[PDB]
Design a protein around this ligand. Structure first.
Ligand SMILES: CCOc1cc(N2CCC(O)CC2)ccc1Nc1ncc2c(n1)N(C)c1ccccc1C(=O)N2C
Length: 127
């Protein structure tokens, strides 16, 4: 159940550069998901020690959570919006491939993913 080090959230040697899409991902997508009543399991990395999940990080090879994504967006870690979208997708995929369907945590992920996909439908165009 040992936990990996937390993912990196800052890149000390990349330029500070926004795009309209990255602004949208932070100020619309992340903001909306973060305040949802079902966000709390996803606001920090899975703690396999405290949740007693010895197999979690043997099955989940790319851990991801919204706290990491939030910090990455705030620190301008991503070079483009697609890297951020992939992190969201990884977070949901991890939940769905580890947990049993109908588990409460899967229902929570499904509700958050619906909101995520609706907001991504309105992602502004590259510019
Ligand atoms: C920072 C606080 O974190 C928690 C507190 C409590 N508590 C608070 C108080 C109550 O009275 C007692 C339970 C329960 C869970 C979490 N966290 C948490 N993080 C990640 C996961 C998750 N739960 N669930 C539920 C999972 C369960 C099994 C296998 C995988 C997962 C999973 O995929 N995710 C995303």
């Amino acid at each position: 159940s040992m936990n990996p080090p937390p993912p990196e959230t800052s890149n000390p040697n990349k330029p500070k550069r926004q795009t309209n899409q990255l602004q949208y991902l932070l100020r619309v997508v992340l903001k909306t998901l973060w305040k949802h009543q079902f966000a709390w399991p996803f606001q920090q990395p899975v703690d396999a020690v405290k949740l007693n999940l010895p197999d979690y990080y043997k099955i989940i090879k790319t851990p991801m959570d919204m706290g990491t994504i939030k910090k990455r967006l705030e620190n301008n870690y991503y070079w483009n919006a697609q890297e951020c979208i992939q992190d969201f997708n990884t977070m949901f995929t991890n939940c769905y491939i580890y947990n049993k369907p109908g588990d409460d945590i899967v229902l929570m992920a499904e509700a958050l993913e619906k909101l995520f996909l609706q907001k991504i439908n309105e992602l502004p165009t590259e510019e």
